[PDB]
Structure formats: structure tokens, C-alpha cells
């Protein structure tokens, strides 16, 4: 039942207070939206598990629908590879449910604690982006509650393709997704055949990813060094691989294939690994991508980070593949970097500086990772933003759907 609560992003900054609804009944959500439309307060926004670091899933003064309560899985079909799920279904929940059927979650982020609705809302990406694209590429259909109380059937190629692609990466600003059909990835096992490599510099890391080699693997990411001075800066521990076939597993693991003095270094070949072993090996979360061809410019950001004295120990490096049709979708082909800055004096001035260099080089920031950037910067980082706003207003003219991010980045 609707009640006032303090809500925060994962980064635990900029708290605001809102009214919160938690229901497993789609009809209560419809009535709440229609009621909010007829009364027109500060607005409605859907919330998933709250794994975004910023302010996209909160609406100070308004209403927030806690979506995790709406978590029924309707059907799993190995033949079509299709899965019909409530937007509040967890990726962890869906994984556990679809694995015995031989189906794999097509895009897996760093944590399995995200809703389908939040996966779509931020168009999440994973280690397999260069081969699979982002989460939006794998949504066959979705049911979207709009400001007028209508539930719209949306498809990537069909009649409402425009609303579909404005919803993907739309950060809940086109309405509340109630339900989706996801096309899962077929798999024989829950294991990876993996290669490990180590490089000695930023240049080597770049070159390693630049020789067409990435096409040999479905999944690829790397940790890199952001603390050492050149020539050691950028040296990386690269982890690449693909889902194993059954005949590639040792016999001891073939029993249960879909189950949930040596020198130890980062170089190995054709290693069989489970999900934990392949993935796993306050703080300002910062993520940016610059275009592939902007190699020297990308290098300059990494160098400047190191020179700045802001020291990040947890950094992820990935080469993104082609993007998709969503105007607000974060990934573009090019160099993606996640960095974790300990909060210190001068950090905020520095990230402001980083934002503008990313802007100049043709790059963008991720909505799931931001709480600080300015509206003029963000608009400029997404060339299709005005096209998106026009679509958003067509389905929500009176601004029934709103969030702290939407007011901050002027997305209404
Ligand atoms: C440890 C960690 C690792 C991560 N790794 C990755 C990664 O590798 N790749 C990556 O892309 N992201 C990553 N993320 C970010 C995360 O995947 C996204 O922020 C995701 O959107 C969070 O899902 P959520 O269910 O918590 O949604 P929330 O954070 O609650 O909300 C996200 C947005 O989606 C909207 N939304 C949520 N549910 C609905 C719905 N039912 N209908 C309409 N709109 C909705 C909200 O309005 C909000 O704008 C990571 C986060 C953490 C904490
Ligand atoms: N950046 O946040 C990031 C990018 C990618 C990639 F897909 F672009 F390559 C992948 C990625 C990832 O796989 N895991 C991340 N984690 C964040 C920190 C971590 C591990 C997972 O450490 C503990 C905490 C619970 O999560 S970030 C990431």
C-alpha cells in the first residue's frame, strides 16, 4: 500500500523521499497511474532492484512503484527459446528457472540482481556485447503501461517500433513495463571454455583487441592497471571465452552439465570454467565509452586519470560492438571503461573535466552509473535525444512519468 519512504541509488548519494507502492497485482499499478494522471502531482516512476548507482529509479515527492513484487514467470519454451515474464522478475530468478530447459540469459551484467524491467530500462550490456549486443536486442515483445492507462503491445520491428526503442534505454520515462517476452540463448552447458592473457601496457591492451581476435569469442572483458605510471599504465588481465558444448566438458561434469608447484598467472588456454570462475576474477562509479577510431583520445583519458592522483583499483575494460536502434542506448562501438574512484577532495571537479573530454571525443556516459553530470553535457552526448523527447511526450504529454534524473538531465 502507498507509503512514504526514503529512496537511494546503489551509489548511496542524493537521497529523496517518495510514496512507494508494492504490489503483485498489475491492476493496482494501472489504477495508480490513472489516478496519478487525473490528479497530476510530481509523477510516477518504476523501480527495480535499485542497482543503478544514480537517481533514475527515484522520484522525490512523487510515486515510485516497487516492481520486484511483480515477479511471476509465465512460460519457458525450449523450442521457440522464448520466455514470458513479469517485469519484476530477477535475472538471478530467471537464470535458475531457464537453465534446466537449456536456455541462457542472453545478456548478463556484473550482478544477477536486476529486474527484466531494469534490464530494459537501462538497456544493460555485458561481457558478450560485441557478439550479442545489449539486452534490448533480445526482447521479442513488451507490455507498456502508458500515461493514458493503456497497456501497449510493443515489438522491435512491428507497428509501435518507435515506442519500443524509446522504451529500451528509456529509464522508465515512457511508462511502466509490466511484462516481456525475452528470446533466450540456447546452451548445452552452464560452463565456459576460456582463454586468459596478460599484457604489459595500454598500447598492448589496445593492440590485443585490435587484430580481429575478438570474433573468436562470444564473451570478453579485462581488468586493467589505472595506478602505475607509463609504460606500465593500462596493462591488462584479459578474460575471453564462449559457452561450452557438451563434448568439451570433462566426463565428471557431463553428469550434470547445466549445474548451477604450478605458476599461477593470467595466461591459460581452453580452460573449463563455471559462472563464478569466469565472471568474478564511498566510491564514485564512473563508466564511459569513446568511439573505436578515437584511439589516441581514449589513451589520453586513461593517462590523465593516472596523472590526476585519483586511484582506482577496480577497473573493467571492454571493446563494445555495434549499437542498436534505441536513441538513449549507452553502448556504441568502441572503448568502454568502468572505474571506481574513492571519494576525495577534487574528485567532482575532475569527473566534470572527464565528462567534457568524453563529450569532445564522441563518447557518452551511462545512465545506470551517473548522478553528477549536467543536462547540456548529457544531451550533447546523445545526438538523437530530441527525437527521443518528442516520442516520450507523444505518449506522456502532461509528464505523468518523471524521476530525479529526468528533472536533472531535462528529459521531460
Ligand atoms: C555490482 C554491479 C554490477 C553491474 N554491472 C553492470 C554491467 O556489467 N552492465 C550493465 O549494463 N550494467 C551493470 N550494472 C547496472 C545495472 O545492471 C543497471 O543499473 C540496471 O538498470 C539495474 O536494474 P534494476 O532492476 O536495479 O533497476 P533500477 O536500478 O531499479 O532502475 C533502473 C531504471 O530502469 C527503470 N525501470 C526499472 N523497472 C522498470 C519497469 N518494470 N518498467 C519500466 N521501467 C523500469 C527505472 O525507471 C530506472 O530508470 C551493475 C550494477 C551493479 C550494482
Ligand atoms: N563496468 O561496471 C563493467 C563493465 C562490464 C563490461 F560488460 F562492459 F565489460 C562488465 C562488468 C562486470 O562484469 N562486472 C562488474 N562488477 C562490479 C564490481 C563487482 C564485480 C562485478 O565487485 C563486487 C561487486 C558486487 O561487483 S562492473 C562491469
UniProtKB/Swiss-Prot annotation:
Activity regulation, short description: Is inhibited by 8-nitro-benzothiazinones (BTZs) such as BTZ043; BTZs are a new class of antimycobacterial agents that block formation of both cell-wall lipoarabinomannan and arabinogalactan via inhibition of decaprenyl-phospho-arabinose (DPA) synthesis. BTZs are suicide inhibitors that act via covalent modification of DprE1; the essential nitro group of these compounds is reduced by DprE1 to a nitroso group, which then specifically reacts with Cys-338 of DprE1 to form an irreversible semimercaptal adduct.
Phenotype reported upon loss of the gene: Disruption of this gene is only possible in the presence of a plasmid-encoded copy of the gene. Curing of this 'rescue' plasmid from the bacterial population results in a cessation of growth, demonstrating gene essentiality.
Outcome, altering residue 338 to G: 14-fold decrease in catalytic efficiency. Reduces BTZs to inert metabolites while avoiding covalent inactivation
Gene Ontology molecular function terms on file: D-arabinono-1,4-lactone oxidase activity; FAD binding; L-gulono-1,4-lactone dehydrogenase activity
Catalytic reactions on record: trans,octa-cis-decaprenylphospho-beta-D-ribofuranose + FAD + H(+) = trans,octa-cis-decaprenylphospho-beta-D-erythro-pentofuranosid-2-ulose + FADH2
Record keywords, A-Z: Antibiotic resistance, Cell wall biogenesis/degradation, FAD, Flavoprotein, Nucleotide-binding, Oxidoreductase, Periplasm
Recorded superkingdom: Bacteria
Gene3D superfamilies tied to this protein: 3.30.465.10, Uridine Diphospho-n-acetylenolpyruvylglucosamine Reductase, domain 2 (3.30.43.10), Vanillyl-alcohol Oxidase, Chain A, domain 4 (1.10.45.10)
InterPro entries for the chain: ALO_C, FAD-bd_PCMH, FAD-bd_PCMH-like_sf, FAD-bd_PCMH_sub1, FAD-bd_PCMH_sub2, FAD_lactone_oxidase-like, Oxid_FAD_bind_N, Vanillyl_alc_oxidase_C-sub2
Effect of mutating residue 287 to A: 10-fold decrease in catalytic efficiency
The keyword Cell inner membrane belongs to this UniProt entry's keyword annotation: no
The protein's annotated pathway: Cell wall biogenesis; cell wall polysaccharide biosynthesis
Subcellular location as annotated: Periplasm
Domain (FAD-binding PCMH-type) ranges: 13-187
Protein name stated in the entry: Decaprenylphosphoryl-beta-D-ribose oxidase
Amino acid at each position: 500500500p502507498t507509503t512514504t519512504k526514503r529512496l537511494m541509488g546503489w551509489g548511496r548519494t542524493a537521497p529523496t523521499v517518495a510514496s512507494v507502492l508494492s504490489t503483485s497485482d498489475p491492476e493496482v499499478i494501472v489504477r495508480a497511474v490513472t489516478r496519478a494522471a487525473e490528479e497530476g502531482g510530481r509523477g510516477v516512476i518504476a523501480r527495480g532492484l535499485g542497482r543503478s548507482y544514480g537517481d533514475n529509479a527515484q522520484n522525490g515527492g512523487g510515486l515510485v512503484i516497487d516492481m520486484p513484487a511483480l515477479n511471476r514467470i509465465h512460460s519457458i519454451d525450449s523450442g521457440t527459446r522464448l520466455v514470458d515474464v513479469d517485469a519484476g522478475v530477477s535475472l538471478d530468478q530467471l537464470m535458475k528457472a531457464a537453465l534446466p530447459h537449456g536456455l541462457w540469459v542472453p545478456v548478463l551484467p556484473g550482478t544477477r540482481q536486476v529486474t527484466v524491467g531494469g534490464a530494459i530500462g537501462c538497456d544493460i550490456h555485458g561481457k558478450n556485447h560485441h557478439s550479442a549486443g545489449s539486452f534490448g536486442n533480445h526482447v521479442r515483445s513488451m507490455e507498456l503501461l502508458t500515461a493514458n492507462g493503456e497497456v501497449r503491445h510493443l515489438t522491435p520491428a512491428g507497428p509501435d517500433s518507435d515506442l519500443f526503442w524509446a522504451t529500451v534505454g528509456g529509464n522508465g520515462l515512457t511508462g511502466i513495463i509490466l511484462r516481456a517476452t525475452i528470446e533466450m540463448t540456447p546452451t548445452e552447458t552452464a560452463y565456459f571454455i576460456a582463454d586468459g592473457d596478460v599484457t604489459g601496457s595500454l598500447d598492448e591492451t589496445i593492440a590485443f583487441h585490435s587484430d580481429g581476435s575478438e570474433a573468436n569469442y562470444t564473451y570478453s572483458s579485462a581488468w586493467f592497471d589505472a595506478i602505475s605510471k607509463p609504460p606500465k599504465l593500462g596493462r591488462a588481465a584479459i578474460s575471453r571465452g564462449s559457452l561450452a558444448k557438451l563434448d568439451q566438458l570433462p566426463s565428471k561434469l557431463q553428469k550434470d552439465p547445466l549445474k548451477f608447484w604450478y605458476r599461477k598467472s593470467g595466461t591459460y588456454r581452453n580452460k573449463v570454467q563455471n559462472l563464478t570462475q569466469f565472471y568474478h576474477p564511498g566510491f564514485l562509479q564512473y563508466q564511459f565509452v569513446v568511439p573505436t577510431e578515437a584511439v589516441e583520445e581514449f589513451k589520453s583519458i586513461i593517462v590523465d586519470i593516472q596523472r590526476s592522483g585519483h586511484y582506482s583499483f577496480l577497473n573493467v575494460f571492454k571493446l563494445f560492438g555495434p549499437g542498436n536502434q534505441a536513441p538513449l542506448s549507452f553502448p556504441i562501438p568502441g572503448w568502454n571503461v568502468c572505474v571506481d574512484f574513492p571519494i576525495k577532495a577534487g574528485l567532482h571537479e575532475f569527473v566534470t573535466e572527464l565528462d567534457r573530454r568524453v563529450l569532445e571525443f564522441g563518447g557518452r556516459l551511462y545512465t545506470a552509473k551517473d548522478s553528477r553530470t549536467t543536462a547540456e553535457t548529457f544531451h550533447a552526448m546523445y545526438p538523437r535525444i530530441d527525437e527521443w523527447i518528442r516520442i516520450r511526450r507523444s505518449v506522456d504529454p502532461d509528464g505523468v512519468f518523471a524521476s530525479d534524473m529526468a528533472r536533472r538531465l531535462q528529459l521531460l
